[PDB]
Amino acid sequence: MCLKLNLLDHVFANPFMNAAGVLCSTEEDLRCMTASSSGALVSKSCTSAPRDGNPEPRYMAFPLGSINSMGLPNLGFDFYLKYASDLHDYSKKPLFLSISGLSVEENVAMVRRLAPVAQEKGVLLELNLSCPNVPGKPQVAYDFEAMRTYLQQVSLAYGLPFGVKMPPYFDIAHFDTAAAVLNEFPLVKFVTCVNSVGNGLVIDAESESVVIKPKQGFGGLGGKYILPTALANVNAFYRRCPDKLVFGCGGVYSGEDAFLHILAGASMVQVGTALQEEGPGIFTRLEDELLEIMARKGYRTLEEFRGRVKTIE
Amino acid sequence: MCLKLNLLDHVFANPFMNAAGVLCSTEEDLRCMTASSSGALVSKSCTSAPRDGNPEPRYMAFPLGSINSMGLPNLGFDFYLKYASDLHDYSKKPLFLSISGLSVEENVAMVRRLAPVAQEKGVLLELNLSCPNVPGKPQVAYDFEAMRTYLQQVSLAYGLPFGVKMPPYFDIAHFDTAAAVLNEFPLVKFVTCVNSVGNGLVIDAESESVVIKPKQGFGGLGGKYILPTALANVNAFYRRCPDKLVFGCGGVYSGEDAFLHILAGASMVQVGTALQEEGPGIFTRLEDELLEIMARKGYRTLEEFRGRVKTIE
Numbered sequence A, B: 001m002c003l004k005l006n007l008l009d010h011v012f013a014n015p016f017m018n019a020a021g022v023l024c025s026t027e028e029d030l031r032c033m034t035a036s037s038s039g040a041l042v043s044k045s046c047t048s049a050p051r052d053g054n055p056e057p058r059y060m061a062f063p064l065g066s067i068n069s070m071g072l073p074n075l076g077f078d079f080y081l082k083y084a085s086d087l088h089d090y091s092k093k094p095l096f097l098s099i100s101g102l103s104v105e106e107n108v109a110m111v112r113r114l115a116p117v118a119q120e121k122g123v124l125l126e127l128n129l130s131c132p133n134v135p136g137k138p139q140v141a142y143d144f145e146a147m148r149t150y151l152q153q154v155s156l157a158y159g160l161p162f163g164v165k166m167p168p169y170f171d172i173a174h175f176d177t178a179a180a181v182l183n184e185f186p187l188v189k190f191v192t193c194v195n196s197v198g199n200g201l202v203i204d205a206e207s208e209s210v211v212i213k214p215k216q217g218f219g220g221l222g223g224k225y226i227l228p229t230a231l232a233n234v235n236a237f238y239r240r241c242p243d244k245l246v247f248g249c250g251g252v253y254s255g256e257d258a259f260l261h262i263l264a265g266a267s268m269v270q271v272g273t274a275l276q277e278e279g280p281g282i283f284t285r286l287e288d289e290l291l292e293i294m295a296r297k298g299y300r301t302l303e304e305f306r307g308r309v310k311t312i313e
Ligand SMILES: Cc1cc2nc3c(=O)[nH]c(=O)nc-3n(C[C@H](O)[C@H](O)[C@H](O)COP(=O)(O)O)c2cc1C
Pocket: A019, A020, A021, A022, A044, A045, A059, A066, A068, A070, A072, A098, A128, A165, A194, A195, A196, A221, A222, A223, A224, A226, A249, A250, A251, A252, A270, A271, A272, A273, A274, A276
């Protein structure tokens, strides 16, 4: 009947939103997401200062998904904060703001500024743990001590409920260690699984060439390639973090794919590649498709099946 | 025009072989592989003792690839060593023997006994590092200290050229660290990239159930899902290990997929999922298709294009 839900002290029309980085960089983008049928929107991950990002071409898409090395292009934190404090129409849907500083200190400085606006307006923070490569050290969410420092510092500085955008993991021990880090932080109220599958390489057979210019063609994978990885991550953290929400991201092209995310444990479902390729019309199609699968199955609510994926024996 | 290779002091009719675990567990399997048009074969990764593996269903395939948690079912090392010593017809094609002991000591025990057979008959060792060690620790090749220890102990015990089967990596830092570990070992003459993309989760929408029984449905991914990941790892190790060969594995269904692996740096090209699904006739098709692409492009030999992927600007 209707897909409306309540999370994090906000009401949402439906569980769909963009994935950070897609259709969310400019004021134009944000207004378009706000005008869409999505249940929420999230802004492009920002730095304290504006960034141009990497040389083009830096994104390409294919029948099975996408590759990107954007380089964190963004208008800077002051723009996104202004959008949250003065321009967003909260009557339309909730807003999440994604932050991706290049150091702990930069994150801290952004979150301290965000906190009053969060209190006054209700904007929600998604903290992105992924970053450009620094030779000699791993990405922050793949360095569990660094992750723990980031979260300790942001938690102290911010003081309010927030979420974290996670890269995928591929090892059960890693799921156990990551979730145990996150569970140390009561203010981490949602976990978004997943960011792009890192450092894939698409090659064009005719030209014998990589398809993006930065990083010798290496870039993060999204889309169909990554749905089983995304589901695995959603479910692993759903199981491990019973006091948190999990937001699913990765490989959603249809209401059926959303249904699978929700079965695995997702509360919100984010759409990246498929949104980039189809445009914001996609949200009406996803809603219709999800309601049709629910009706066929007899489900009246998302809660009836969230996390209820069945195991064998 | 030809697909011939000469490497590791062996001659190969073409670069294609099975991926370890597919069509290689029983004498019947190995005889089938030998009868096929493949350029080589590898035996099922073995332990000291026979294993039944995990409960079924433990492998499933779909249009975009496969998922498995087999549990290392195998006939034991003594069977594979007998096949290599007594049964295999080396006039037909070269044989690789894959080992996947559950501790460094089990590996050392096997390679000590393999050595004289390697020396006399020419069987080639593939050591599987994308394998469990202590539960609650990451797989061996995700634990760089453990990986170093396995390589030091097996190199001392074996004393002959061998290769290693690697899981995929997703972070530049890990490519750099892993390749640096491998480059400490002069006896590691080939590197096979990649094993399955770990701990994915396939869910069936109609039944609302995972599709394999072990590990609550979590298992390693193969097939179309993983081709960009496999190409990235092939190229990353090809660039970082200039004194070693790289063998490609992951997402090969066509001659074009194989051509992309070879442009990335692959010497041998291994076929898992697609061989599991299509059967050994696949090798004639892959040879025909790769030759057709070479004819269109005017390439007469594999070396004309191996490693020659172009980057932008
Ligand atoms: C062009 C592009 C830019 C992105 N930028 C960001 C970003 O700024 N912050 C972030 O958290 N994830 C970013 N991502 C990752 C996506 O949010 C999402 O995690 C990933 O694309 C997987 O979802 P999908 O399979 O729906 O594409 C970006 C993805 C794309 C394709």
